[PDB]
Coordinates of C-alpha atoms and ligand atoms in Angstrom, one line a residue:
Chain A
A2 CA 15.1 16.7 36.6
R3 CA 13.9 20.1 38.1
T4 CA 16.0 23.3 37.9
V5 CA 18.3 22.9 40.9
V6 CA 18.5 25.9 43.3
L7 CA 20.9 26.4 46.1
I8 CA 20.2 29.3 48.5
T9 CA 22.0 30.8 51.5
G10 CA 20.7 32.6 54.5
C11 CA 17.4 30.4 54.6
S12 CA 17.2 30.7 58.4
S13 CA 15.1 33.9 58.6
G14 CA 13.9 36.6 56.1
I15 CA 14.2 36.6 52.2
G16 CA 16.1 33.4 51.7
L17 CA 13.5 31.6 53.8
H18 CA 10.5 32.9 51.9
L19 CA 12.1 32.3 48.5
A20 CA 13.2 28.8 49.4
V21 CA 9.5 27.9 50.1
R22 CA 8.2 29.9 47.1
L23 CA 10.2 27.9 44.5
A24 CA 9.7 24.5 46.2
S25 CA 5.9 25.0 46.3
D26 CA 5.7 26.1 42.7
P27 CA 2.5 25.2 40.7
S28 CA 5.0 23.6 38.2
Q29 CA 6.9 21.5 40.8
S30 CA 9.8 23.0 38.7
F31 CA 12.7 23.7 41.2
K32 CA 14.5 21.3 43.6
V33 CA 15.7 23.6 46.5
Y34 CA 18.7 23.2 48.8
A35 CA 18.3 25.8 51.5
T36 CA 21.4 26.4 53.5
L37 CA 21.9 27.5 57.2
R38 CA 24.7 28.4 59.5
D39 CA 23.0 26.6 62.5
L40 CA 21.2 23.6 60.9
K41 CA 19.1 23.5 64.2
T42 CA 17.1 26.7 63.5
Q43 CA 15.4 25.2 60.4
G44 CA 12.3 25.0 62.7
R45 CA 11.2 28.4 61.4
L46 CA 11.4 27.1 57.8
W47 CA 10.1 23.4 57.6
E48 CA 6.7 24.3 58.9
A49 CA 6.1 26.8 56.0
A50 CA 6.8 24.1 53.4
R51 CA 5.1 21.1 55.1
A52 CA 2.5 24.0 55.5
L53 CA 2.5 24.6 51.6
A54 CA 2.3 21.0 50.4
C55 CA 5.9 21.1 49.1
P56 CA 5.9 17.8 47.0
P57 CA 8.1 14.6 47.5
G58 CA 11.4 16.2 48.4
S59 CA 11.3 19.6 46.8
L60 CA 13.2 21.2 49.8
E61 CA 16.6 19.8 51.1
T62 CA 18.4 21.6 54.0
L63 CA 22.3 21.7 54.2
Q64 CA 24.6 23.4 56.6
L65 CA 26.7 26.2 55.0
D66 CA 28.9 28.5 56.9
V67 CA 29.9 31.1 54.2
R68 CA 33.0 32.1 56.3
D69 CA 34.5 28.7 55.7
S70 CA 35.0 27.1 52.3
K71 CA 35.3 23.4 53.4
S72 CA 31.7 23.9 54.6
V73 CA 31.0 25.5 51.1
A74 CA 32.7 22.5 49.5
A75 CA 30.9 19.8 51.5
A76 CA 27.7 21.5 50.5
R77 CA 28.6 21.2 46.7
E78 CA 29.6 17.5 47.2
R79 CA 26.3 16.8 48.9
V80 CA 24.3 18.3 46.0
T81 CA 23.8 14.9 44.4
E82 CA 22.3 16.0 41.0
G83 CA 25.9 17.3 40.3
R84 CA 24.9 20.6 38.8
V85 CA 23.4 23.8 40.1
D86 CA 21.1 25.8 37.7
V87 CA 20.4 28.6 40.1
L88 CA 22.6 30.0 42.9
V89 CA 21.3 32.5 45.3
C90 CA 23.8 34.4 47.4
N91 CA 21.7 35.8 50.1
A92 CA 23.4 35.5 53.5
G93 CA 24.3 38.9 54.9
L94 CA 25.0 41.0 57.9
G95 CA 24.3 44.5 58.8
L96 CA 26.4 46.9 60.8
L97 CA 24.9 50.0 62.1
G98 CA 26.7 52.6 64.0
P99 CA 29.2 55.4 64.2
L100 CA 32.3 54.2 62.5
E101 CA 34.7 54.8 65.4
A102 CA 32.2 52.9 67.6
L103 CA 32.4 49.7 65.5
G104 CA 34.4 46.7 66.6
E105 CA 37.2 45.6 64.3
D106 CA 36.0 42.0 64.5
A107 CA 32.5 43.2 63.7
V108 CA 33.9 45.2 60.7
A109 CA 35.8 42.1 59.4
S110 CA 33.0 39.6 60.0
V111 CA 30.6 41.8 57.9
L112 CA 33.2 41.9 55.0
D113 CA 34.0 38.2 55.4
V114 CA 30.3 37.2 55.5
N115 CA 28.9 39.7 52.9
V116 CA 31.7 39.8 50.4
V117 CA 34.1 37.0 50.9
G118 CA 31.4 34.5 51.6
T119 CA 29.9 35.4 48.2
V120 CA 33.3 35.0 46.6
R121 CA 33.6 31.5 48.1
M122 CA 30.3 30.5 46.6
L123 CA 31.2 31.8 43.2
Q124 CA 34.6 30.1 43.4
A125 CA 32.9 26.8 44.4
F126 CA 30.0 26.8 41.8
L127 CA 30.7 29.1 39.1
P128 CA 33.3 26.9 37.2
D129 CA 30.7 24.1 36.7
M130 CA 28.3 26.6 35.1
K131 CA 31.0 27.9 32.8
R132 CA 32.0 24.4 31.9
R133 CA 28.3 23.9 30.8
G134 CA 27.4 27.2 29.2
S135 CA 24.3 28.1 31.3
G136 CA 23.5 28.9 34.9
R137 CA 21.9 31.8 36.8
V138 CA 23.2 33.5 39.8
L139 CA 21.3 35.8 42.1
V140 CA 22.7 38.0 44.7
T141 CA 20.9 39.8 47.4
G142 CA 21.8 43.4 46.7
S143 CA 20.8 46.6 48.5
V144 CA 20.0 50.2 47.6
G145 CA 22.9 50.8 50.1
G146 CA 25.3 49.1 47.7
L147 CA 24.2 51.8 45.2
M148 CA 24.3 54.9 47.3
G149 CA 26.0 55.6 50.6
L150 CA 24.0 55.7 53.9
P151 CA 25.2 57.5 57.0
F152 CA 26.1 55.2 59.9
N153 CA 25.9 52.2 57.5
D154 CA 29.5 52.9 56.3
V155 CA 30.6 49.3 56.4
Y156 CA 27.4 47.6 55.5
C157 CA 27.4 49.9 52.5
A158 CA 31.0 49.3 51.9
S159 CA 30.1 45.7 51.9
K160 CA 27.2 46.0 49.4
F161 CA 29.1 48.3 47.1
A162 CA 31.6 45.5 47.0
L163 CA 29.1 43.0 45.8
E164 CA 28.2 45.3 43.0
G165 CA 31.9 45.6 42.1
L166 CA 32.4 41.9 42.2
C167 CA 29.2 41.0 40.2
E168 CA 29.7 43.6 37.6
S169 CA 33.3 42.5 36.9
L170 CA 32.3 38.9 36.6
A171 CA 29.3 39.8 34.4
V172 CA 31.6 41.3 31.9
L173 CA 33.6 38.1 31.6
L174 CA 30.5 35.7 31.6
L175 CA 28.7 37.5 28.8
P176 CA 29.8 35.1 26.0
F177 CA 29.8 32.1 28.3
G178 CA 26.0 32.0 28.6
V179 CA 26.0 32.3 32.4
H180 CA 23.8 35.0 33.9
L181 CA 24.3 37.2 36.8
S182 CA 21.8 39.5 38.4
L183 CA 21.7 41.6 41.6
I184 CA 18.3 42.1 43.3
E185 CA 18.4 45.5 44.9
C186 CA 16.2 45.8 47.9
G187 CA 15.2 48.9 49.8
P188 CA 14.5 47.9 53.4
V189 CA 12.7 44.7 54.4
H190 CA 11.1 43.2 57.7
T191 CA 13.0 40.4 59.7
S200 CA 23.6 51.2 74.5
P201 CA 23.2 54.9 74.5
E202 CA 26.0 55.5 77.1
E203 CA 28.4 53.1 75.2
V204 CA 27.7 55.1 72.0
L205 CA 28.4 58.5 73.6
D206 CA 31.5 57.3 75.4
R207 CA 32.9 55.9 72.0
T208 CA 32.1 59.0 70.0
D209 CA 31.4 62.6 70.6
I210 CA 28.3 64.8 71.4
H211 CA 27.6 65.8 67.9
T212 CA 27.7 62.2 66.4
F213 CA 25.7 60.8 69.2
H214 CA 22.9 63.3 68.3
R215 CA 23.2 62.5 64.6
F216 CA 23.1 58.8 65.3
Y217 CA 19.7 59.1 67.2
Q218 CA 18.2 61.4 64.6
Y219 CA 19.3 59.1 61.9
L220 CA 17.6 56.3 64.0
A221 CA 14.3 58.2 64.3
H222 CA 14.4 59.0 60.5
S223 CA 15.4 55.5 59.8
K224 CA 12.5 54.0 61.9
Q225 CA 10.2 56.4 60.1
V226 CA 11.2 55.3 56.5
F227 CA 11.0 51.6 57.7
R228 CA 7.3 52.2 58.6
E229 CA 6.4 54.2 55.3
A230 CA 8.2 51.8 52.9
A231 CA 9.8 48.6 54.3
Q232 CA 8.9 45.7 52.0
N233 CA 8.1 42.0 53.0
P234 CA 10.2 39.0 52.1
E235 CA 7.7 37.4 49.7
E236 CA 7.5 40.5 47.5
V237 CA 11.3 40.6 47.4
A238 CA 11.1 36.9 46.7
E239 CA 9.0 37.6 43.7
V240 CA 11.7 39.7 42.0
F241 CA 14.0 36.8 42.1
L242 CA 11.5 34.7 40.0
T243 CA 10.9 37.5 37.7
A244 CA 14.7 37.3 37.1
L245 CA 14.9 33.5 37.1
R246 CA 12.3 33.3 34.5
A247 CA 13.6 36.2 32.5
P248 CA 14.6 35.2 29.0
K249 CA 17.7 37.5 28.8
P250 CA 18.1 38.9 32.3
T251 CA 19.7 42.1 33.3
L252 CA 22.6 42.7 35.7
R253 CA 20.1 44.5 38.2
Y254 CA 16.5 44.3 39.3
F255 CA 15.0 46.7 41.7
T256 CA 12.4 45.6 44.1
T257 CA 10.7 49.1 44.7
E258 CA 10.9 52.2 42.5
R259 CA 11.1 54.4 45.6
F260 CA 14.8 55.3 45.5
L261 CA 15.1 55.8 41.8
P262 CA 14.9 59.5 42.5
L263 CA 17.8 59.7 45.0
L264 CA 19.7 57.3 42.8
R265 CA 19.2 59.5 39.7
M266 CA 20.6 62.6 41.8
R267 CA 23.8 60.5 42.3
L268 CA 24.0 59.4 38.7
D269 CA 23.4 63.1 37.6
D270 CA 26.5 64.5 39.4
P271 CA 29.7 62.3 39.6
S272 CA 31.5 64.8 41.8
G273 CA 29.1 63.4 44.3
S274 CA 28.3 66.9 45.6
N275 CA 24.5 66.8 44.7
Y276 CA 24.0 63.4 46.3
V277 CA 25.8 64.2 49.5
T278 CA 23.8 67.4 50.1
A279 CA 20.5 65.7 49.1
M280 CA 20.9 62.6 51.2
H281 CA 22.0 64.7 54.2
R282 CA 18.8 66.8 53.7
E283 CA 16.7 63.7 53.4
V284 CA 18.1 62.2 56.6
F285 CA 18.5 65.2 59.0
Chain B
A2 CA 52.6 76.1 61.9
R3 CA 52.6 73.9 58.8
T4 CA 49.7 71.7 57.5
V5 CA 50.3 68.1 58.9
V6 CA 49.9 65.5 56.3
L7 CA 49.9 61.7 56.9
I8 CA 50.0 59.4 54.0
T9 CA 50.0 55.6 53.9
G10 CA 51.7 53.4 51.3
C11 CA 54.5 55.8 50.5
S12 CA 56.8 53.0 49.5
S13 CA 56.2 53.7 45.9
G14 CA 53.9 55.1 43.2
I15 CA 51.3 57.7 44.0
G16 CA 52.1 58.0 47.7
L17 CA 55.8 58.3 47.2
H18 CA 55.3 61.0 44.6
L19 CA 52.6 62.7 46.7
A20 CA 54.7 62.8 49.9
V21 CA 57.7 64.4 48.1
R22 CA 55.6 66.8 46.2
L23 CA 54.1 68.1 49.4
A24 CA 57.4 68.0 51.4
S25 CA 59.1 70.1 48.7
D26 CA 56.3 72.5 48.0
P27 CA 57.9 76.0 47.7
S28 CA 55.4 77.2 50.3
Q29 CA 57.1 74.9 52.9
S30 CA 53.4 74.7 54.0
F31 CA 53.4 70.9 54.6
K32 CA 54.7 68.7 57.3
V33 CA 54.6 65.2 55.8
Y34 CA 54.6 61.9 57.6
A35 CA 55.2 59.3 55.0
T36 CA 54.2 55.8 56.1
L37 CA 55.3 52.4 54.7
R38 CA 54.4 48.8 55.5
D39 CA 58.1 48.0 55.8
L40 CA 60.7 50.6 56.7
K41 CA 63.4 48.8 54.6
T42 CA 61.6 50.0 51.3
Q43 CA 62.0 53.6 52.2
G44 CA 65.1 54.1 49.9
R45 CA 63.4 55.2 46.7
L46 CA 61.4 57.7 48.8
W47 CA 64.6 59.2 50.3
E48 CA 66.4 59.2 46.9
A49 CA 63.3 61.1 45.7
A50 CA 63.3 63.4 48.8
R51 CA 66.8 64.9 48.5
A52 CA 66.5 65.0 44.6
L53 CA 63.5 67.4 44.9
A54 CA 65.4 68.9 47.8
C55 CA 62.7 68.6 50.5
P56 CA 63.9 70.8 53.2
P57 CA 65.2 69.2 56.4
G58 CA 62.3 68.2 58.6
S59 CA 59.5 68.5 55.9
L60 CA 59.4 64.7 55.6
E61 CA 59.7 61.9 58.2
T62 CA 58.9 58.3 57.6
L63 CA 56.9 55.9 59.9
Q64 CA 56.3 52.2 59.9
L65 CA 52.6 51.6 59.5
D66 CA 51.0 48.4 58.5
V67 CA 47.3 49.1 57.8
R68 CA 46.4 45.4 58.6
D69 CA 47.2 46.1 62.3
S70 CA 45.5 48.7 64.4
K71 CA 48.3 48.8 66.9
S72 CA 50.7 49.8 64.1
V73 CA 48.0 52.4 63.3
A74 CA 47.9 53.7 66.9
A75 CA 51.8 53.6 67.3
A76 CA 52.0 55.9 64.2
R77 CA 49.3 58.2 65.3
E78 CA 51.2 58.6 68.5
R79 CA 54.4 59.6 66.6
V80 CA 52.6 62.7 65.2
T81 CA 54.5 65.1 67.4
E82 CA 52.3 68.0 66.6
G83 CA 49.4 65.9 68.0
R84 CA 47.1 66.7 65.0
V85 CA 46.5 65.7 61.4
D86 CA 45.2 68.3 59.0
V87 CA 45.3 66.1 56.0
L88 CA 45.0 62.3 56.0
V89 CA 45.8 60.4 52.8
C90 CA 44.5 56.9 52.7
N91 CA 46.4 55.5 49.8
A92 CA 47.8 52.1 50.7
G93 CA 46.5 49.5 48.3
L94 CA 46.8 46.2 46.6
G95 CA 45.9 44.7 43.3
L96 CA 44.6 41.3 42.5
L97 CA 44.3 40.2 39.0
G98 CA 43.0 36.9 37.7
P99 CA 40.1 34.5 37.2
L100 CA 38.1 34.6 40.4
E101 CA 38.3 30.8 40.7
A102 CA 42.0 30.9 40.3
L103 CA 42.4 33.4 43.2
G104 CA 43.4 32.0 46.6
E105 CA 41.5 32.6 49.7
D106 CA 44.1 34.4 51.8
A107 CA 44.9 36.7 48.8
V108 CA 41.3 37.6 48.2
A109 CA 41.1 38.5 52.0
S110 CA 44.4 40.2 52.1
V111 CA 43.0 42.7 49.6
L112 CA 39.9 43.4 51.5
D113 CA 41.7 43.6 54.7
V114 CA 44.2 46.1 53.3
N115 CA 42.2 48.1 50.9
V116 CA 38.9 48.3 52.9
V117 CA 39.4 47.4 56.6
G118 CA 42.8 49.1 56.4
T119 CA 41.1 52.4 55.4
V120 CA 38.6 51.8 58.2
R121 CA 41.2 51.4 60.9
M122 CA 42.8 54.6 59.6
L123 CA 39.6 56.5 59.6
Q124 CA 38.7 55.0 63.0
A125 CA 42.0 56.2 64.5
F126 CA 42.1 59.7 62.9
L127 CA 38.5 61.1 62.3
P128 CA 37.8 61.4 66.1
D129 CA 40.4 64.2 66.6
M130 CA 39.3 65.9 63.3
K131 CA 35.7 66.0 64.4
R132 CA 36.6 67.5 67.9
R133 CA 38.6 70.3 66.2
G134 CA 35.9 70.7 63.5
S135 CA 38.6 70.5 60.8
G136 CA 40.5 68.0 58.7
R137 CA 40.8 66.7 55.2
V138 CA 40.9 63.1 54.2
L139 CA 41.9 62.1 50.8
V140 CA 41.5 58.6 49.6
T141 CA 43.1 57.0 46.6
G142 CA 40.3 55.9 44.3
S143 CA 40.3 53.9 41.1
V144 CA 38.5 53.5 37.8
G145 CA 37.7 50.0 39.2
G146 CA 35.7 51.5 42.1
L147 CA 33.4 53.1 39.5
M148 CA 32.9 50.2 37.0
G149 CA 33.7 46.5 37.1
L150 CA 36.5 45.1 35.1
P151 CA 37.0 41.5 34.2
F152 CA 39.6 39.6 36.1
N153 CA 39.8 42.4 38.7
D154 CA 36.7 41.1 40.6
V155 CA 38.1 41.4 44.1
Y156 CA 40.2 44.4 43.3
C157 CA 37.1 46.3 42.0
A158 CA 35.0 44.9 44.9
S159 CA 37.6 46.3 47.4
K160 CA 37.5 49.7 45.4
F161 CA 33.6 49.8 45.1
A162 CA 33.7 49.4 49.0
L163 CA 35.8 52.6 49.4
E164 CA 33.2 54.5 47.3
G165 CA 30.6 53.1 49.7
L166 CA 32.5 53.7 52.9
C167 CA 33.5 57.1 51.8
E168 CA 30.2 58.4 50.5
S169 CA 28.4 57.1 53.6
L170 CA 30.8 59.0 55.9
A171 CA 30.6 62.1 53.7
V172 CA 26.9 62.2 54.1
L173 CA 27.4 62.3 57.9
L174 CA 30.6 64.5 57.8
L175 CA 29.1 67.6 56.1
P176 CA 28.1 69.6 59.2
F177 CA 31.3 68.7 61.0
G178 CA 33.8 70.7 58.8
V179 CA 35.7 67.5 58.0
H180 CA 36.0 66.8 54.3
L181 CA 36.5 63.5 52.7
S182 CA 37.3 63.2 49.0
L183 CA 38.1 60.3 46.6
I184 CA 40.9 60.9 44.0
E185 CA 39.6 58.7 41.1
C186 CA 42.7 57.5 39.2
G187 CA 42.9 55.7 35.9
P188 CA 46.0 53.7 35.2
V189 CA 49.2 55.3 36.5
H190 CA 53.0 54.7 35.9
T191 CA 55.2 53.2 38.7
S200 CA 52.2 30.3 36.9
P201 CA 50.3 30.1 33.6
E202 CA 50.3 26.4 34.4
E203 CA 48.7 27.2 37.8
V204 CA 46.1 29.4 36.0
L205 CA 45.2 26.8 33.4
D206 CA 44.6 24.2 36.1
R207 CA 42.4 26.4 38.4
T208 CA 40.1 27.4 35.5
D209 CA 38.6 26.4 32.2
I210 CA 40.3 26.7 28.8
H211 CA 38.0 29.4 27.4
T212 CA 38.6 31.6 30.5
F213 CA 42.3 31.0 30.0
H214 CA 42.2 32.5 26.6
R215 CA 40.0 35.3 27.8
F216 CA 42.5 36.1 30.6
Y217 CA 45.6 36.4 28.3
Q218 CA 43.4 38.4 25.9
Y219 CA 42.5 40.8 28.7
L220 CA 46.1 41.0 29.8
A221 CA 47.1 41.9 26.2
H222 CA 44.5 44.7 26.0
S223 CA 45.4 45.7 29.6
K224 CA 49.1 46.2 28.6
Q225 CA 47.7 47.8 25.4
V226 CA 45.8 50.4 27.5
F227 CA 48.6 51.0 30.0
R228 CA 50.7 52.3 26.9
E229 CA 47.9 54.6 25.5
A230 CA 46.8 55.8 28.9
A231 CA 49.0 55.7 32.0
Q232 CA 49.6 59.0 33.7
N233 CA 52.6 60.4 35.4
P234 CA 52.2 60.2 39.2
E235 CA 53.2 63.8 39.2
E236 CA 50.1 64.6 37.3
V237 CA 48.0 62.5 39.8
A238 CA 49.6 64.1 42.8
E239 CA 48.8 67.5 41.5
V240 CA 45.1 66.3 41.6
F241 CA 45.5 65.5 45.2
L242 CA 46.8 69.1 45.7
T243 CA 43.9 70.6 43.9
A244 CA 41.6 68.7 46.2
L245 CA 43.4 69.7 49.4
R246 CA 43.4 73.3 48.6
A247 CA 39.9 73.5 47.2
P248 CA 37.8 75.7 49.6
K249 CA 34.6 73.7 48.5
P250 CA 35.8 70.1 48.3
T251 CA 33.7 67.7 46.4
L252 CA 33.5 64.0 47.2
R253 CA 35.2 62.9 44.0
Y254 CA 38.0 64.2 41.8
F255 CA 39.0 62.5 38.6
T256 CA 42.6 62.6 37.3
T257 CA 41.4 62.2 33.6
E258 CA 38.5 62.6 31.3
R259 CA 39.1 59.3 29.4
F260 CA 36.9 56.9 31.2
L261 CA 34.1 59.5 32.0
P262 CA 31.8 58.5 29.1
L263 CA 31.9 54.8 30.1
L264 CA 31.0 56.1 33.4
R265 CA 28.1 58.1 31.9
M266 CA 26.7 55.2 29.8
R267 CA 27.0 53.1 33.0
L268 CA 25.1 55.6 35.0
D269 CA 22.0 56.1 32.7
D270 CA 21.4 52.4 32.3
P271 CA 20.5 51.3 35.9
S272 CA 19.6 47.8 34.6
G273 CA 23.3 47.5 34.0
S274 CA 23.3 45.4 30.8
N275 CA 24.5 48.3 28.5
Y276 CA 27.6 48.8 30.5
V277 CA 28.2 45.1 30.6
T278 CA 28.3 44.8 26.7
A279 CA 30.0 48.1 26.2
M280 CA 32.9 46.9 28.4
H281 CA 33.0 43.5 26.9
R282 CA 33.4 45.1 23.4
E283 CA 36.0 47.5 24.7
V284 CA 38.0 44.6 26.1
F285 CA 37.8 41.5 23.6
Ligands
J3Z1 C1 18.8 56.3 54.6 C2 17.3 56.0 54.5 C3 16.9 55.2 55.8 C4 17.4 53.8 55.8 C5 17.2 53.0 54.5 C6 17.8 51.6 54.5 C7 18.4 50.9 55.6 C8 18.9 49.6 55.4 C9 18.8 49.0 54.2 O1 19.3 47.7 54.0 C10 18.2 49.6 53.1 C11 17.7 50.9 53.2 C12 17.0 51.6 52.1 C13 17.4 53.1 51.9 C14 17.6 53.8 53.3 C15 16.9 55.2 53.3 C16 16.9 56.1 52.1 C17 16.2 57.4 52.7 C18 16.6 57.3 54.2 O2 16.3 58.1 55.0

């Protein structure tokens, strides 16, 4: 049949726009299972594939709570072609704030969702692909998994993790014929008493400047889901794909400053200059 | 008054050797609180204490379980001096196997201990260090935080995360007079049924091949913890502390060839060759 594709975080954003893109393909090439934590909020999504003349059943919607591996497992059992050719690990959470401000539950949910959720998926699906000797797996990365961002300490922790996880696997799955690629996004588009009370005067100031500077870079350089979604195809279709794919070239310079000096000294100074 | 040092995971290895090295420094500069998950395992440490002759009072132990933020606050409370000049986030866990063989609680145990653990510590101790405008935090890093290694997927994920968490904080922490540095360690000194069934046959061979090479490399490469602890010392004293310190040159060129190929596929082969 088609190349089967299962994707996570299809509610809003990237996962949504990529789900529709592959379903609607001029080839009719890819059967898509989009997955959602609330199956109800698939309103957003079904319009923009009815909208695009997505052929007889090119888009299926399953419920997948990445925090829970029974839910991951039901989802595999209810993929009735009994393979996956393309796995997209996209669900993710952000956590912005001063570290000592952040709720412990919030900290663990970001890890559980960003990192462990992705481990569940690869646990559930990855054996089948190795059994076979082909399969592709695509993980929504972040430039914040590649370099550290003030006040995104955990989010970044969480995306560095994915790199770690994916790079280690990649090394093992070289001779197996299974392929693994990270898609590294810059930004993309879709308390003050409390903050002060849970930190100090100096951090509070730095948080709000970071925010201004952040809102700024968002407006000069935030990409849109469908662009990002293109880089996924570019890597699906790739004959022999690479471990990474960058969506913009805009942070190659800051990155090269980090790769220049492993002591980390140049990068810390730079990025602090950049931000404040 | 002495420099107040608080160190997690002093049961053994690096943190045991670091706590005693500091307690017995001829300067008698250091007041060390050596923490352990379980107080019953503090024997080797005390053998080691009077053995290097740490003076009376240079060393006390505390129970501290980095999984539990109440255990973190109880400990912080036992710092009689009411301040911490040097924090050493060293507690750590390993996890070695095919990803799909690893169990769910284990996978999470590691993140919770290696990553969240370090967050709780930093959450409970950075506030005072920022108020004072002084403080050093040292974090036990790994080769596996810098480059992925087959069959250490979750281990490396948890160590990539510290790189992330640490770098992001360091970008914020530079105007505050609080220094955070990572001590990047290579290897350091001090069922098969189950594994076959939870994975495929070719993986199985690759695992005991890895293991063979991994024991192979622990004989040609493993440093004394004495050597490693001296690197922590150097970082502590350094007037201009950099974000990373490496205890060895060995793996630096794998790190370089990793760094100048952002695509990542050179590193991937390089490491596969190295290993199999
Ligand atoms: C830190 C940053 C603002 C916030 C950006 C940000 C925030 C969230 C995210 O998922 C990705 C990115 C891309 C890089 C970040 C910028 C680099 C230069 C700058 O000032």
